[PDB]
Design a protein around this motif. Structure first.
Motif, PDB file in Angstrom:
ATOM      1  N   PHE A   1       9.683   3.207  -0.519  1.00 53.87           N
ATOM      2  CA  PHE A   1      10.643   4.304  -0.372  1.00 53.87           C
ATOM      3  C   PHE A   1      11.907   3.928   0.386  1.00 53.87           C
ATOM      4  O   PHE A   1      11.894   3.029   1.233  1.00 53.87           O
ATOM      5  N   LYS A   2      12.992   4.634   0.078  1.00 57.42           N
ATOM      6  CA  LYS A   2      14.226   4.476   0.824  1.00 57.42           C
ATOM      7  C   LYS A   2      13.930   4.748   2.300  1.00 57.42           C
ATOM      8  O   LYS A   2      14.113   3.871   3.149  1.00 57.42           O
TER       9      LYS A   2
ATOM     10  N   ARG B   1       4.906   4.154  -0.929  1.00 56.44           N
ATOM     11  CA  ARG B   1       4.521   3.891  -2.312  1.00 56.44           C
ATOM     12  C   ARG B   1       3.492   2.776  -2.358  1.00 56.44           C
ATOM     13  O   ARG B   1       3.029   2.382  -3.434  1.00 56.44           O
TER      14      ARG B   1
HETATM   15 CL   LIG Z   1      13.479   7.291  -2.758  1.00 56.75          CL
END
Ligand SMILES: [Cl-]
Ligand SMILES: [Cl-]
Ligand SMILES: [Cl-]
Ligand SMILES: [Cl-]
Ligand SMILES: [Cl-]
Ligand SMILES: [Cl-]
Lengths: 488, 480
Positions: free
Chosen positions: B134-135, B144
């Protein structure tokens, strides 16, 4: 319901039939990949448990570093279904490959591991460092594939260690190797030869590569069962993995890698299989016993159902997993074949001529020898039998293996032995160009898979080398005895 | 080296600090994907073992269905590429448009299910997924990348299935409470909260106090015959009439690790229930005078032996360079349940100091009584941890009946238990009005679950939102 090809005559189709018709695997409609049904996985769970226990005894610590493979190996799924195996799904958004190509070709955490290792190892106090992890990977299946054996789908283990010495590391390497041997013997009842790989067939990043070699008689083909690498200081030097010694001066760690795979399963299957179907050694069989009622003419079917259920109790009470097949729809024969095919070690048959006799009959999956046994003996006898089936499997296997090796002292004898589905053990000078020369010559003299004979391993248990002996190929002084054979 | 944030001053950077400096995970690439070092994996492996054992007791066979995750309602199952032919059925909503692993499984099941003899069918498998992180990640919680277990079953009767669902739910409770010393509450998820495809969803809920947010710990759906009808998974019964199966599905995730940390984490660093820590005891020598040196090392060594002999994994930190404070911090950071200090006074008095990690309480100990007292101390450490996490949990749950009581109870970071309609209509209105009245990556106020352990519901007795007769008490709060 039955197996159409005879193992000894149409081997490949035999294998196919066996593994699909024994509820071991299931093919998805797409991608040609297979589900490991409970039947298959169970085996894996067994050997997995064994390994874990034994390496814990070796102070190996389980972990998980994300696997990396170069993007190029995953394109066939990327085009076909736009999805990747979850354990390596990150490597696409990675973009450019890195660092050395010799490791990126194969899914591993080595690329990552080696990268972070110098930050974990700074002192001698940090050594030895011993890691393991369990992996699963699946790629778009081969066009013409062989499950377990020639396939892009794998479930395996990989271990990595770093040491202060070379003595430490090498000892460890061979300890692991013998664990792989026990893996195959005590659990898959499969015999293997321990050996060292030829310099051309060894891993490139390796100092040397020790292997466990197995042999398929019906194919006349050897196949690598497991590997343990002494890596030396190659990757230490490569990745600046040094530590400060006890005298406080910086020195390179000595590393090892090892790994064994679901391949073992397939190998087992190829080792023990009947024309009847699957033959599991008991340790890797979910049910050890199936219980079958035999009756046609009218009788007290209830009396039997109970008698049987009593046996089932006697056994499930000894934590011996049974299945009692009282299906009304199928003949006792149908059942016989159905569980014989699914690889159940022992079948107990119960008949009306046994309830008034208070005995029953027990039949071995391996040699189909039957015997009559009283009800109170049933548990004992069944146990001792489950042991014996194993010993017997391992024996017939071992004999086949032993019979498949020919000791030659010259090239004349080679081709003959090859065409008889045998491998040879020959005095080699182990010089490299000769490897390729022998491959090319043996490929040129033969009638999917290759016909060229490869050096398989220099076995650890070496025959004496006479002072004279020349290499059966070069005519140079022979260095050691080496197994050559056609292979997977 | 040490945590430059306090748990109840900035929770997020605290958690990140703790998971990275306690050496549970490590980050290598720009990806933000992370290595699971042996410490984390020890835990996962423990709960893995327990779970495999107890579910084998329930005749659940382990398996492996290969998966192909497409990047990019998540729950535990990832969205997978479709590996079978779907058939004309599909569905108006969800279904093929966004498939999962479960869904592939079901697409295969009809082959394995002819008659009533083929039931119950009972599968579990363990999994590992590593996608591009993920960002703005939150490891073990919003990531993730994770490990998980997912099981599925098919049954003849609804009763068989349901019973198994709650069996699994209790297993999840023991997963959390026995092994991780984290207290959860069993409940049934709300109707506008339940899994899309389930008859009903039962959940194990946990509550992080310092942060005021609850979180789904585990999940155990009863699916009835919805997926059976969709994929045509039918069997001939005893009377040769075709019948739809009675499916369940449950899963738990490496998420639990994230929870456990959050539950026991000190300002000193990681804190582990002794079950799930590899080294149970660290030993530290204390001296400056070289005269004592060779003779302290013996003492320590002896104790090392004494504990090692008794299958108690120990470390003996005699690093000559590092100060004792360094070591205390280091091994406290790593949640080593017990520290034994040895100085000259301990040689003289034939004793040694023992320090509980959970409450840093010290005591002197007769060098022979070490063993026993150490065992008993590990046990009381586990118990204490649970006790504390449980009471903290209680103290952030308030029982209330009116709307204002509720709202007040909320930006006091508590979680509430209120009378309710169980009308799915009301709920998103609840969520958005409550978000609008107050006051990252989330969020509003959700209904969490309706506990199985119900207090008496007065006959009176209005809901808190609609004022309609309240059916049951429900848990409300903000989530992950
Ligand atoms: Cl994201
Ligand atoms: Cl060691
Ligand atoms: Cl290909
Ligand atoms: Cl191909
Ligand atoms: Cl059952
Ligand atoms: Cl994000």
């Amino acid at each position: 319901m039955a197996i159409t090809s005879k193992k000894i005559e149409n081997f490949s189709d035999w294998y196919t039939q066996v593994i699909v018709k024994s509820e071991l695997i299931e093919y998805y409609d797409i991608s040609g990949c297979y589900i490991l049904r409970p039947a298959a996985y169970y085996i894996w769970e067994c050997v997995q448990a064994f390994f874990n226990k034994e390496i814990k005894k070796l102070n190996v610590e389980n972990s998980y570093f994300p696997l990396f493979v170069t993007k190029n190996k995953l394109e066939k799924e990327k085009n076909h279904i736009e999805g990747f195996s979850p354990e390596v799904a990150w490597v696409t958004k990675y973009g450019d490959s890195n660092l050395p190509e010799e490791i990126a070709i194969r899914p591993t955490s080595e690329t990552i591991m080696y990268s972070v290792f110098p930050k974990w190892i700074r002192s001698y106090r940090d050594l030895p460092l011993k890691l393991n992890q369990w992996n699963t990977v699946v790629r778009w299946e081969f066009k013409q594939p062989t499950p377990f054996i020639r396939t892009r789908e794998f479930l395996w283990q990989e271990g990595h260690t770093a040491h202060k010495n070379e003595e430490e590391a090498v000892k460890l390497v061979f300890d692991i190797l013998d664990l792989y041997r026990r893996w195959y013997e005590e659990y898959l009842a499969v015999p293997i030869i321990k050996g060292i790989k030829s310099e051309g067939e060894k891993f490139g990043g390796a100092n040397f590569t020790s292997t466990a070699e197995a042999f398929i008689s019906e194919n006349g083909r050897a196949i690598q069962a497991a590997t343990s690498h002494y890596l030396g200081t190659n990757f230490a030097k490569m990745f600046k993995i040094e530590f400060e010694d006890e005298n406080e001066v910086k020195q390179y760690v000595h590393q090892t890698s090892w790994g064994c795979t679901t391949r073992s399963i397939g190998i087992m299957i190829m080792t023990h299989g009947d024309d009847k179907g699957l033959v599991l050694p008991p340790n890797v069989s979910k049910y050890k016993v199936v219980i079958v009622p035999i009756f046609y003419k009218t009788t007290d079917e209830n009396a039997i159902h109970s008698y049987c259920k009593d046996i089932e109790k006697i056994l499930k009470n000894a934590q011996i997993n049974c299945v009692y097949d009282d299906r009304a729809s199928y003949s006792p024969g149908y059942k016989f074949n159905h569980w014989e095919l699914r690889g159940i070690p022992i079948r107990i048959e119960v008949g009306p001529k046994d309830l008034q006799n208070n005995s029953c009959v027990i039949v071995r999956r391996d040699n189909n020898e039957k015997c009559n046994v009283k009800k109170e003996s049933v548990l004992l006898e069944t146990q001792q039998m489950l042991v014996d089936i194993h010993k017997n499997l391992f024996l017939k296997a071992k004999k086949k293996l032993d019979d498949s090796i020919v000791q030659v002292t010259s090239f004349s004898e080679v081709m003959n032995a090859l065409n008889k589905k045998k491998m040879v053990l020959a005095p080699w000078c182990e010089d490299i160009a000769t490897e390729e020369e022998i491959k090319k010559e043996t490929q040129r003299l033969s009638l999917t898979l290759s016909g060229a004979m490869k050096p398989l391993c220099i076995p650890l248990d070496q025959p004496p080398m006479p002072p004279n002996m020349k290499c059966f190929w070069s005519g140079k002084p022979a260095k050691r005895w080496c197994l050559f054979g056609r292979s997977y």
